[PDB]
């Protein structure tokens, strides 16, 4: 019985992987975008102060 079970268990492990790695990659991308976004708004603020002087 244990043998069979462990076999099944191995399959489950693979299943988790099918998602995990991919998710991490996606996160990295959005992180980069977020940083850029912040800069952009900061730049906008600076531009908003350009006319005020």
């Amino acid at each position: 019985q244990v043998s069979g079970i462990i076999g099944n268990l191995r399959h489950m492990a693979l299943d988790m992987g099918n998602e995990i790695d991919t998710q991490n990659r996606q996160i990295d991308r959005i992180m980069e975008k977020a940083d850029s976004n912040k800069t952009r708004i900061d730049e906008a603020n600076q531009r908003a102060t350009k006319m005020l002087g």
């Binding site: 940083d35 850029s36 800069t39 730049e43």
Partner: protein, 275 residues
């Protein structure tokens, strides 16, 4: 095919129109049109011209008042040139790293350092240059207190050094990583494996000090006794003590039967067995 020729013709026409517009407030329009031309050339599957246009647009943006956009353009140009002249891409990525570090973006700087090290090692045969970039990335991570990336970089550089016969630095790095993992709540149980790596280096140096080294490692980490790494170390020592052929062959066969030994591990094992 026809599609590639049409894409090339469209890219050439767009570049000519951009040149006409720039030749005849205008700086922003020139930058935007140059970026659009670079994107079109990239979509046209022309690597050299697309990379050159992207580099020119990045330089124009540098002329423009902006920093993050310049760094993004630099990294995109480096990625594009990844399949082109490596030297220009490396220089552009180094400049982007400097720009990032200027405002304190040390995390992205370390990431780009690791990227340039990776490209240098995979593309060219000179891997020594990548070692400096990896060390700089590790130092940046240590300054930022990133344990995982620092440990990965230290392990990679130690492995490369061991492949280069620099046993002292590799063994020091392996011991430091092992003790850090032991202190840390996680990765401690795997630290035994790291210890073996360090031991391997010492095993290549001498045999009479091997007994003292293994005794010190055992007393430092008494739980290491049940580890199969201690079994491998003692079996290798016993095999090397007596000049026979069966001992080392059966030891390597038995240890391989569980898991496939790494190429560097097997190379060092063969080197020690031959002598």
């Amino acid at each position: 095919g026809m599609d590639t020729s049409g894409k090339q013709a469209e890219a050439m026409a767009l570049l000519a129109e951009a040149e006409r517009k720039v030749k005849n407030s205008k700086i922003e329009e020139a930058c935007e049109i140059y970026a659009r031309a670079a994107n079109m050339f990239k979509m046209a599957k022309n690597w050299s011209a697309a990379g050159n246009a992207f580099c020119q647009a990045a330089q124009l943006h540098l002329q423009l008042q902006s920093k993050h956009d310049a760094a993004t353009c630099f990294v995109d140009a480096g990625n594009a040139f990844k399949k082109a002249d490596p030297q220009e891409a490396i220089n552009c990525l180094m400049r982007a790293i400097e720009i990032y570090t200027d405002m304190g973006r040390f995390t992205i700087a370390a990431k780009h350092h690791i990227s340039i090290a990776e490209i240098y090692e995979t593309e060219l045969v000179d891997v020594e240059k990548a070692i400096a970039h990896y060390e700089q990335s590790a130092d940046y991570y240590k300054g930022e207190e990133s344990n995982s990336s620092a440990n990965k970089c230290l392990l990679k550089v130690a492995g490369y050094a061991a492949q280069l016969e620099q046993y002292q630095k590799a063994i020091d790095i392996y011991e430091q990583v092992g003790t850090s993992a032991m202190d840390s709540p996680l990765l401690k149980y795997s630290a035994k494996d790291y210890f073996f790596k360090a031991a391997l280096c010492h095993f290549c140096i001498d045999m009479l000090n091997a007994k003292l080294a293994v005794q010190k490692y055992e007393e430092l980490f008494p739980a290491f006794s049940d580890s199969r790494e201690c079994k491998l170390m003692k079996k290798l020592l016993e095999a090397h003590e007596e000049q026979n052929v069966d001992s080392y062959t059966e030891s390597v066969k038995e240890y391989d039967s569980i898991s496939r030994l790494d190429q560097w591990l097997t190379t060092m094992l063969l080197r020690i067995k031959k002598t």
